Symmetry: C3
Subunit: 314 residues, 3 copies
């Protein structure tokens, strides 16, 4: 089965430059070559060139609305292109705002898709709830169907159409929620397993339930959106919004391991990896190895080990 790497060197999703350097870091560490070693076929799409919109005046509080809006539209145009030819889409980003390109492009070809959002935030505010005009923490808002019309239209997001409903997605690793956000998720009653939950049940029971909830009834493709800030700052320090007491290195692979196991992974997002934010070359090396590591896990590489079929090693 096909795999297509699509770099998204973008960052206007937030105030700290540097995340457009993620792709270049991930590829540098050896992601593309490490993947060709798996049972899959790998075609690297290269890095998309994001045209900058001049005079991108702020829509109320939101910053860079036409820029962010334009990039994502170019992303969702690319994604549909690989998913159309039946090939799994791995997007190497920038900030999370690129999810709107990532998941909108996915749904065009697999409208019945679900989403597992591994993040420490819901990154799902509305241009009416953000205390910051930053769109990297609003990706979901623009996606949700039940959120259509619950906030103004934002210059550059006309092309967007709510693709998934509050029933088809599940958060994992939440720990920093704004009053606003907590409201929405409760009100719309979305399924999540916040830090608290993943203390009480354990990452073992948590993927068991998230699977019966999303795949309990019908079998449908999986779109995994992984904010490196999902695991703790001791495993991913090179991120813009780090937050204490997160998901261990282990539960992370566990996650990515089980998702492989479903044979249902359709879209994968490796967002917000920032090489310039590492306090030491180590932490940058740390954040990337564990970013690559999770990316190889969603594609077979197990911790008990692997071996090539039909090969008698004796």
């Amino acid at each position: 089965k096909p795999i297509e790497i699509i770099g998204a060197p973008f960052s206007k999703g937030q105030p700290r430059g540097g995340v457009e350097k993620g792709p270049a870091a991930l590829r540098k560490a050896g992601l593309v070559e490490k993947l060709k070693e798996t049972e899959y076929n790998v075609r690297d799409h290269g890095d998309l060139a994001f045209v900058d919109v001049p005079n991108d005046s702020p829509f109320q509080i939101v910053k860079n609305p036409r820029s962010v809006g334009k990039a994502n539209e170019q992303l969702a145009a690319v994604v549909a292109e690989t998913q159309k030819n039946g090939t799994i889409s791995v997007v190497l980003g920038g900030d999370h705002s690129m999810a709107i390109g990532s998941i909108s492009g996915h749904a065009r070809v697999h409208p019945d898709l679900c989403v597992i959002w591994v993040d420490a935030h819901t990154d799902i505010n509305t241009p009416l709830t953000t205390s910051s005009g930053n769109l990297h923490g609003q990706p979901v808002a623009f996606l949700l169907k039940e959120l259509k019309g619950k906030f103004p239209d934002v210059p550059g997001f006309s092309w967007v159409t709510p693709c998934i409903s509050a029933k088809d997605i599940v958060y994992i690793g939440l720990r920093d929620v704004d009053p606003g956000e907590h409201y929405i998720i409760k009100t719309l009653g979305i399924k999540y397993f916040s830090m608290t939950e993943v203390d009480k049940l354990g990452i073992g029971k948590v993927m068991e339930e998230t699977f019966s909830y999303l795949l309990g009834r019908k079998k449908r493709p999986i779109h995994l959106s992984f904010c490196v800030d999902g695991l703790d700052p001791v495993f991913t320090p090179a991120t813009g919004t780090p937050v204490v007491g997160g998901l261990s290195y282990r539960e992370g692979l566990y996650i990515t391991e089980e998702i492989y196991k479903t044979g249902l992974l359709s879209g994968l997002d490796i967002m917000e990896v920032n090489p310039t934010l590492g306090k030491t070359p180590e932490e940058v090396t740390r954040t990337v190895n564990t970013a690559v590591a999770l990316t190889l896990s969603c594609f077979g590489t197990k911790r008990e080990g692997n071996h090539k079929p039909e090969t008698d090693y004796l």
Copy 2:
């Protein structure tokens, strides 16, 4: 419901000076104002002046017995006073030996109360079993009813009256216990979950069984004494007696979260946070930041998030 912050800048309890700075370290970090942000009312009682006793000769091994006694007596006098006006007490200490006063004053108004001791030690040595005349490691030996008269009367501790029995207390996070201490808890049969127990059951099940143990039969107030050294040093640096293999930030959080949920916490202790014992300013910020995290957990703040009632954020 009322909350009353009581400043206990005491340290005589032990040899390492620096703990009487705890309050000033927790207040500085924003504890007081952080709390008024919750659904509760907050009145800061201020820091109690502790009269020093001249010529506080040592009773055999014990050190500063009269000094440590009078303070506590003035602590139970302040506590009992605010609990009388139906308000929850949060004591920012010093060394733990002040618990003596926080639990003694508490029981005068709620004599049927229980105690969830989260710490790395049992601080239950008798003036006869301590290898150090230190009182921060004995607060319990004085409170226990089954321990009345199993050791000599210590000058300054005549006013004390064992308010609780070996039945109404459970320990959490035990890992450093002295031969004498383990004996006592085995003999009197106290309910505990030593780190070994938390690895076995999970911080999930553990809180499930400690609740049905202390609250399976009758519903009573919860006095929560928390020795910062309760968690591992990696999280709680700036503590006098740090001991490897401790309770994570997450577990110490899941505990406090659940103590809220009961709606039964009555008295709270935030003991042994030492500012001067931090190897770097970071480590002083850290322990503090997470001593605060917990204090704001005991009162609502959830990781999944919080939103104000009756407010429609849409």
Copy 3:
């Protein structure tokens, strides 16, 4: 209940020097003295003088076959001697390749013994499957009954007799396995708990299932081989092949505590602790402290604490 420490300062098991200094590291940290504080009797059998074989040409890929084979032959003979007199055999190593002598000496006197292999690796390659001629990562290949005659006879290992079968052994914390290795364990179907396992069950249930799998039917002596690298480097950094995402200082103790709990320990190995590889004295002090923390545990020392029998501390 006899204990016999046996220093095996060997290292030819791999390319990095330093491991021979292990014993002389554990010993300084005060291992022997600390053990005498337990309920056991202690006899330190000094360190073994290992004669170096001149002109130890490489058998195909394998390196130091004759020097490694001779050393172990001399270890096994020391071992089988103190097990003979009814004493427990604790071996402070070098490189793990000395397991071969440690477990070989052990099966002579207790041919019905079991082994719990706590290590980040399976150390079970064959001279035909190694990518390196390193014997520290093959010990098991020489011990297995099912592996007899699955490779060529290696110079110096003519004295070795497969003593345990695929059935009496179990791994714990595997997270780095080469293609070959995985195959083997799969094919001979060995009972293990990779890191994924420990995540999904917990160090609680894990020991429950390893005990009922190894001791469910008959009660037999337990040989515990502990590759310090089985833990996470943050706990055991001073090691030759560290690997991210290991067991916690807490599971590590949990494990050694339950093994004490059976009353069946018989043989114990504390291999591959290398003092020269700690980036800082601290990492050397750390690692060491826990190759002992763990040992003094296999002999009782409980985190809940201990107290001497018949001694009324009141």
